[PDB]
């Protein structure tokens, strides 16, 4: 069983890739080829983004996938098979690349922004969520202190409505 089901939407392919590669070690090995592939796609503005279009022919889709894999052994591992399978199954998997990254984080990294009344963009890369959270929050407050602005606490709206409606 994967760390948590990603609720589909072309995330089925990524979920299956995570499960199969988790049968093997294929964890950093899987994510590394994916990161290289995504970087390569970004490295070609066109022919790698316009290549992520439905209009690409089946021969064209297989050829584009093969050419992307042609960047030496940057397409090493089961990611090659997944890319070829998608080449006819579903053309667009950049979101599937991000989902593979999400699965990798779920396997190893975890963590997401808390929120509540803060709009901060931090991270807490630790399995536990009962110790490091406070340290991460205080650090991100005392270091950087970027645009975490929710404008104001919604309780202002709460009190305003509460008083304004008897």
């Amino acid at each position: 069983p994967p760390p948590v089901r990603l609720f589909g939407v072309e995330g089925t392919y990524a979920t299956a890739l995570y499960q199969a590669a988790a049968k093997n070690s294929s964890i950093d090995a899987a994510f590394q080829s994916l990161q290289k592939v995504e970087s390569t796609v970004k490295k070609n503005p066109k022919l790698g983004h316009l290549l992520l279009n439905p209009a690409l022919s089946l021969k064209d889709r297989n050829s584009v996938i093969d050419a992307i894999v042609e960047t030496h052994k940057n397409l090493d591992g089961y990611v090659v098979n997944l890319l070829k399978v998608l080449s006819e199954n579903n053309r667009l998997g950049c979101f599937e690349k991000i989902a593979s990254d999400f699965g990798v984080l779920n396997d190893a990294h975890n963590g997401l922004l808390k929120g509540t009344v803060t709009s901060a963009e931090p991270l807490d890369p630790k399995s536990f969520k009962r110790i490091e959270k406070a340290l991460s929050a205080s650090k991100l407050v005392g270091q950087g202190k970027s645009l975490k602005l929710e404008n104001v606490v919604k309780p202002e709206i709460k009190g305003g409505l509460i008083v304004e409606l008897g």
Partner: protein, 506 residues
């Protein structure tokens, strides 16, 4: 208002406590919203059918806990709401502020007061969809009641838990039939008798707020708001509000009847509730069913009506008699919602279009109207003595059924026609004029005994008033006994015959 300042301080203190104990880190973010339905991701552990508190302020129910995207309809306007706003899990199934204190207060969908009277106390906030009592916790209709307007009511009673239904065209005033029915909660409820108490709770499902004001004023002026909690759902109000409103009325009915006192309910125009369920289903994702309306229309209608019953002494012998009101187009008895409901409700009172302009302010189709309990749970005045009068009501209705173009075969048919037609011109209990359990049988008894039938048909419109006033100020002992003794005995029948002779005389 310094009290408003204190209320603000208390509410903001509660909000500060809530913020300090937010316990909301992985709670859902609304992915998209529309048509009062908001598709929201996250909320990974939200219990099904639990209210969700949304950042834009308007909350809503969570209906379809779909794989991943948990669908929460918005119980308020969308102009405030937007995608990506945080969705806060209330953690509780939708529950309504319920209790005896709501008396005289008009409450919104979940029970938010809307008149402007401030808070109303609570004797429990139960979920909007309670499981109705089964067989053993249920009982028969052993205690009768009064519908107030004669309104073919002694003909077809409305007893303990009698799930009666109605129908009519647009602006048919079936709402007014309901209002008059409610006003009868002043000749028994306004006393002090719990056994006579039938604490009505009307509903307002999808009506023009001006009509709501008219209802409120008519409740106050005739002094009804002392006994009627009218849950409101504006037409301008959002679809989820209207859909949940009948469930709120169900909750109020549980809060009353479950306590052990005999209570009553009258759902508003429920056709609007059905249209709201249509909006909720056909707008969120659910495929439509029969008559293009949502498939579970019967399910929702039953879960509303089936809540009403008359429990046994095991549960306190209390009851929540209900008078659900459905609407058609063109007075259509034959419709999906109308016919399906008429299967669910145990009584029907059909209001036509012709008669609604033809001959009666009530215009209740006596022949068409029926209730599944005529004997058991009828006005003991109208049956224990006037049971022959009930059979005569059925017989004269059948008689007037054949009175269209047939010839004059004899004099018996013609006499039955004239007497029953005078009776029908009589029986319409004028609007907002509930006065019944005193001379109900009198009309049919005098017709067969030839007291009113000898009067002119048109003149009866005042002759009845004179006869009633004569019974009041002249037959005061006998009339008061008929009110109170619970039966019109043969001796009381003779004294009423004497009073009838007096009425015929003067």
């Amino acid at each position: 208002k310094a009290q408003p300042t204190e209320v603000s301080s208390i509410l903001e203190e509660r909000i500060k406590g809530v913020s300090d104990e937010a316990n909301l880190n992985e709670t859902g973010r609304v992915l998209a919203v529309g048509d009062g339905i908001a598709r929201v991701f996250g909320l990974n552990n939200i219990q099904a059918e639990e209210l969700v508190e949304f950042s834009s302020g308007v909350k809503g129910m969570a209906l379809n806990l779909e794989p991943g995207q948990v669908g929460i309809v918005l119980f308020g306007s969308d102009r405030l709401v937007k995608e990506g706003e945080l969705v806060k899990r209330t953690g509780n199934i939708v529950d309504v502020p319920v209790g005896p204190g709501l008396l005289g207060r008009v409450v919104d969908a979940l029970g938010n007061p809307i008149d402007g009277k401030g808070p109303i106390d609570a004797a429990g906030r139960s979920r909007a969809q309670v499981k109705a009592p089964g067989i053993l916790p249920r009982r028969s209709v052993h205690e009768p009641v009064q519908t107030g307007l004669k309104a073919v009511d002694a003909l077809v009673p409305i007893g303990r838990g009698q799930r009666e239904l109605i129908i009519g065209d647009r602006q048919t005033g079936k709402t007014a039939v309901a209002l008059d029915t409610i006003l009868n909660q002043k000749r028994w409820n306004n006393g002090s008798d719990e056994s006579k108490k039938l604490y009505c709770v009307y509903v307002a499902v999808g009506q023009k707020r001006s009509t709501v004001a008219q209802l409120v004023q008519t409740l106050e002026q005739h002094d009804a708001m002392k006994y009627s909690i009218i849950v409101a759902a504006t037409a301008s109000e959002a679809a989820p509000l209207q859909y949940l409103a009948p469930f709120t009325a169900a909750s109020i009915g549980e809060w009353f009847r479950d306590n052990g006192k005999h209570a009553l309910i009258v759902y508003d125009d429920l056709s609007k509730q059905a249209v709201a369920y249509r909006q909720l289903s056909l707008l969120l994702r659910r495929p439509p069913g029969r008559e293009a309306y949502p498939g579970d229309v019967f399910y929702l209608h039953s879960r509303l009506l089936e809540r009403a019953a008359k429990l046994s002494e095991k549960e306190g012998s209390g009851s929540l008699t209900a008078l659900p009101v459905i609407e058609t187009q063109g007075g259509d008895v034959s419709a999906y919602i109308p016919t399906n409901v008429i299967s669910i409700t145990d009584g029907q009172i059909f209001l036509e279009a012709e008669l609604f302009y033809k001959g009666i302010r009530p215009a209740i189709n006596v022949g068409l109207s029926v209730s599944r309990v005529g004997s058991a749970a009828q006005v003991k005045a109208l049956k224990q003595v006037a049971g022959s009068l009930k059979l005569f009501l059925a017989q004269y209705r059948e008689v007037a059924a054949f009175a269209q173009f047939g010839s004059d075969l004899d004099a018996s048919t013609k006499q039955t026609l004239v007497r029953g037609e005078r009776l029908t011109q009589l029986l319409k209990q004028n609007q907002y004029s509930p006065l019944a359990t005193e001379e109900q049988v009198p009309l049919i008894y005098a017709g067969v005994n030839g007291h009113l039938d000898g009067i002119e048909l048109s003149r009866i419109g005042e002759f009845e008033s004179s006869f009633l006033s004569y019974l009041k100020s002249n037959h005061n002992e006998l009339l008061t006994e008929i009110r109170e003794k619970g039966e019109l005995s043969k001796e009381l029948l003779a004294s009423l015959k004497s009073a009838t002779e007096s009425f015929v005389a003067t």
